[PDB]
Structures are given as C-alpha cells and as structure tokens.
Structure 1
Amino acid sequence: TLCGAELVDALQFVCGDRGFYFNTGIVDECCFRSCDLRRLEMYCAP
C-alpha cells in the first residue's frame, strides 16, 4: 500500500525526469487497494 507521503515518493521514483501530468482518484487506487508500477507510470507526463 502506498499512502500519504509514501505515494509521492513512489510517483517520484516512477516519474524520474519525465514529470507529472495535468489537464475516484489516486488515493483509492493505491492507498485502499494494491497498486503496481504498471498503473503508476500513467500519472507521469507523456
């Protein structure tokens, strides 16, 4: 489970130098339920 400050760290590890994306969320998909690297790379910039 990636919750709270852990989720930011995990998305930073996954994003690298790509950066995040902009323009019922990330908490439910990764805090309440198990999440993997296969569905956390889709929050990064294309």
Structure 2
Amino acid sequence: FVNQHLCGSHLVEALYLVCGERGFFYTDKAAKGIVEQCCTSICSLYQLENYCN
C-alpha cells in the first residue's frame, strides 16, 4: 500500500495553510513523526500547529 505517501501529500498542504509566514520544516527527522501520528488518526488544527516553525 501507498497510504502514508498519499497522506504526506495532504499533510504538507495543511502545514502550508496552518503555518502561514512562520513556515515549517518537513525534514526526515521530525517529519516521520507527524506522519506516524497524523496519518494514523486525524490530527486537529492545533496538533498540526505544533509542527510549525
């Protein structure tokens, strides 16, 4: 299956909208961690914000 890669693609658009001019880092380090958590169960806007810069 290709579930997480398909989930990744929507989660960066959500971090571009949530994060704004603060931006975000989607790097191998703490980006496999937003996938472990937000592609397993639905993350709210405030849980998404904790990955912002």
Higher percent of residues as strand: 2
Structure 2 unaligned blocks of 5 or more: 1-5
Structure 1: 4+ residue segments shifted above 2 A = none
Percent identity, please: 56
TM-score for both structures, normalised by structure 1: 0.74
Q: How does 1:1-46 map to 2 (within 5 A)?
A: 3-21=7-25, 25-45=33-53
Instruction: Identify which of structures 1 and 2 has the higher relative contact order when contacts are C-alpha pairs closer than 8 Å and 6+ apart.
Output: 1
TM-score for both structures, normalised by structure 2: 0.66
Distance in 2, Cα, partners of 1:10 & 1:16: 10
Task: Please report the RMSD computed on the Cα atoms of aligned residues, expressed in angstroms.
Answer: 2.2
Matched positions, count: 43
Distance in 2, Cα, partners of 1:39 & 1:33: 11
Higher percent of residues as helix: 2
